[PDB]
Each structure stands twice: as structure tokens, then as C-alpha cells.
Amino acid sequence: GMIALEMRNLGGGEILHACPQESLDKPLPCIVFYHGFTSSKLVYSYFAVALAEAGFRVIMPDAPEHGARYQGDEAGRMQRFWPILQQNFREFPALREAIIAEGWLEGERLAVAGASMGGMTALGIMTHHPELNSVACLMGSGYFRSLSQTLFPSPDFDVDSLNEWDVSHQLASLARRPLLLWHGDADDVVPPEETFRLEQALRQGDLAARLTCVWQKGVRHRITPEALATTVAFFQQHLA
Amino acid sequence: MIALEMRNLGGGEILHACPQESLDKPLPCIVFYHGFTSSKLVYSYFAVALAEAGFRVIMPDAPEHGARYQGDEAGRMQRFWPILQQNFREFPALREAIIAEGWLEGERLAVAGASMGGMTALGIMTHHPELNSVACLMGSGYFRSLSQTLFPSPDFDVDSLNEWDVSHQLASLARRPLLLWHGDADDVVPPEETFRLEQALRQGDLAARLTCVWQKGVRHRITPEALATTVAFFQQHLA
């Protein structure tokens, strides 16, 4: 069916909202989707299209220093990946409250998803919010302390700031609700081992009963039609 | 606020996006072609961005992609070049279908695409000087030579690409505004493809309508800057 999409201000910033046309004036199951680093909610808006076509409401915010928040300091942003990620985690409760205040959320049917930096965001949120319906992380990681040593390392940022969010001491929270981990097995940006290590830790700990882990052979750091279909099908089995 | 729908035209599924207030009105239209092994849904952010700018956007499936993909992953990898050639050939019928829907205002029609889709847009250009403007993002016009290195297709007659290859008809690329965008670290479609076309047009005195945009350090990926450049280009030429 037909979907509606709009840019709207919510919680003090700009979001992208998509939903079925026939449900603009109704609460719905909602997915917050977080975009990747140096990308934007508009570049990742195909997730909103695909999920709204499946009947969901999708809310896409701007990460710090991205989208309408970006002021052109490209070199500085390159040095602030990890503080940007940390602020992304911290902004989730206020965003949830703003969604609820709009009348957009049906009950407790709220999920969180993202790709790359956005998938890292989703996993960190999950450690603090296992009441969520379900979570998806595509070509991401939960091992922030480790990965911040090599991937876009941030000068003058204390790695201890990531302690509360890193998934190493939070695996039972990741096991509490349905979790999708997707990764291309040839990723040359976020190593596939980030996701393999998490899958193996959950399985070895008897914490994998709610885990869906999908690998795509030969795929690098890019979302494919198969990854998108996997994401939609996952939410159709838990959030719908 | 924009509206987006899937529509079935003559047995082919298309993605259509436009401003909600204009659903029942003709508009300037952009046909956007997706990349190889991708789909119109994965590239639908172009439809979102351009509809937010006031355009109607029509996105079809390439042969063996989207709703036309019915299996044979391995076979599809061997058929890049016949898929591209058939993508060129389908444009007139697609335009006729768009017009039959009442979607197109006059002759205000442009084509664009990324990767294989940008190749498609350039090939269409060579045969359609009546178009308003054309955009090719991280693509190439040098089909005959590129077919020997990028996803080569066995048992495909390369000579059938000669009628489409831009290097056999440089003046046709100069007839209308043309955007070439490329990331200079692209490891899938080499940036040299775009550099060589820009230089060929400049050396032929055929670059007066050419806009060439590079992004330093960017690989085979559409960035927010590339997307903004595409929107700004069509605003310049469809206004």
C-alpha cells in the first residue's frame, strides 16, 4: 500500500517519519532506525520505506554532528566518532518520550535498529533498555572498548566513557529480547569478527535462544536487498 | 510530505514517489536506475530526496533484479553486460508507460542512476537528446572497454555495445546538461572512468554543459554530499 514520509521536528531536532498512509492518525508499532557514520537519515531512508511498506511506523533521527546537526567541520567530526556514539546512546530516552508524546506508539511495541555506527547505537541502547520489543544491528559491533582503539580512534576521549555501554558485561540483556545480528562476511570496515565474537559469546553462555544471526557471503560494508528483506522479516516475527 | 507507492505497469513493478499534494497532477519526472545486485527499494532514498525537492521519481527494476529476480544468483553475475544493454532498450517503453499514467508534465523528463544505473543513464542519453538532463553517479560510459574487466560476461558479443558506448558519440553527451559524480577511492568502478570522459569532452570542446564533481577519499558509496549534489543538479536544470 501507499506510504507517507515527512521531515518533522521532534524533541528539539529534525527526524524522518514514515508510516502507512492509512495510519497517519493512529498509534502503531514503531522502529527507531539509526544511520551510519558520515551518512544521514536521508541516505538511510530506504529502511523507512521498506519497513513502512510492511506496516510499521519508522522514526529516523540525526546523530550528533550529522544531518541538520552538521555544520561542515568534516575534519573534526572524523576525530569524534566515539563521543558522537556515546551521545547517540544518551539521547534515546528523550527521543522515546517525544515519540510517545506524539501519540505515535502502540503500547510497548517499540524496537531499535541501525546500520554500522547505528547498529553500535542499537546494541548500546539494548544494554540499558531490555524492555524493548526487539533490536537489530547490521554490520556493527558491541565491543566499543576494543574497536575504538583502531576504528576512527578519537583523540582526547577517555575510553572509560564506553564502559557502561560495551556489551562484554551485558550479554544477558542482549539475550533478553529478540536480537538480529547481520554482517557481510567480507566487510573491510567493521571486521566481521565483531559480530562472530558476539554470536559465539552468546551461544557459549547459553544466551542465544532469542538470537538471529545472518551472514551474507562475499558482501563487504554495504546493505544488500537480502539484508533489507532479512530485517523486515525479523520485525514481522517479533514486533508485528 | 511525500507519498510513495509500488505500481505494476504492464507486468513490471515500479516505485513511484512524489509530493502528496501532487498525486493527481503531472510533474517534472526523474527516472532513477539502481546498481548491480541492488534494487529499486535499496536505492529508494533517491526517490525520497528528489520527491522532497518537488519532483516525481520513477524507479524500475533492472533485468534480473527486484521483482524480476527469480533466483540464479550465480548466473546473474555472468550477465552484467546483457542486463545493462537490455536496461538501455527498455527506456522508450517505460517513458510511454509514465506518460500513459498522466505522470509527466510536457517533456520535463530526466534520467539518473548510480553504478550500473549511471551507465544506464549515459547509454540512454546517447539515444535521447530530447531529455532535460542526465546524472551518472560512480559509473562509466566506456562500456566496450569496461566489459573486459568489470563483471565480464562470457559468450556475450561485446560489439553490440558499440552503438551505446559514449566514446563513439561524444557530441551526444554535450547536447544536454550532464552530471558526473565519483568518489576518488572507488575500488569497484575506477574513478579513471569519469576522469577519462571529462578529459575526452574537454579535448573535444564538448564540455560546456558538463558538471563534474569528485569527492576525495570516498569509495563505491553514495554520500550525503553526492545526494545533495544530485538534487541541486536537477533543481538547476528542471527549474
From TrEMBL, chain A:
Molecular function terms, GO-annotated: monoacylglycerol lipase activity; serine-type peptidase activity
Gene Ontology process terms (BP): proteolysis
Keywords: Hydrolase
Enzyme class: hydrolase
Ranges of residues in domain Peptidase S9 prolyl oligopeptidase catalytic: 86-239
Source domain of life: Bacteria
Pfam families, A to Z: Peptidase_S9
Family matches, as InterPro entries: AB_hydrolase_fold (IPR029058), FrsA_esterase (IPR050261), Peptidase_S9_cat (IPR001375)
Enzyme Commission (EC) number: 3.1.1.23
PANTHER family with a match to the protein in the record: DIENELACTONE HYDROLASE DOMAIN-CONTAINING PROTEIN-RELATED, POLYKETIDE TRANSFERASE AF380
Protein name: Esterase
Organism listed in the record: Klebsiella pneumoniae
Automatic annotation (TrEMBL), chain B:
Pfam families reported for this sequence: Peptidase_S9
Domain of life assignment: Bacteria
Organism per entry: Klebsiella pneumoniae
Enzyme class: hydrolase
Keyword RNA-binding: no
InterPro entries with a match to the protein in the record: AB_hydrolase_fold (IPR029058), FrsA_esterase (IPR050261), Peptidase_S9_cat (IPR001375)
Keywords per UniProt: Hydrolase
Protein name as it appears in the record: Esterase
Any one biological process term the GO annotation gives: proteolysis
KW Hydrolase (keyword) present: yes
NCBIfam families recorded: PRK10566.1
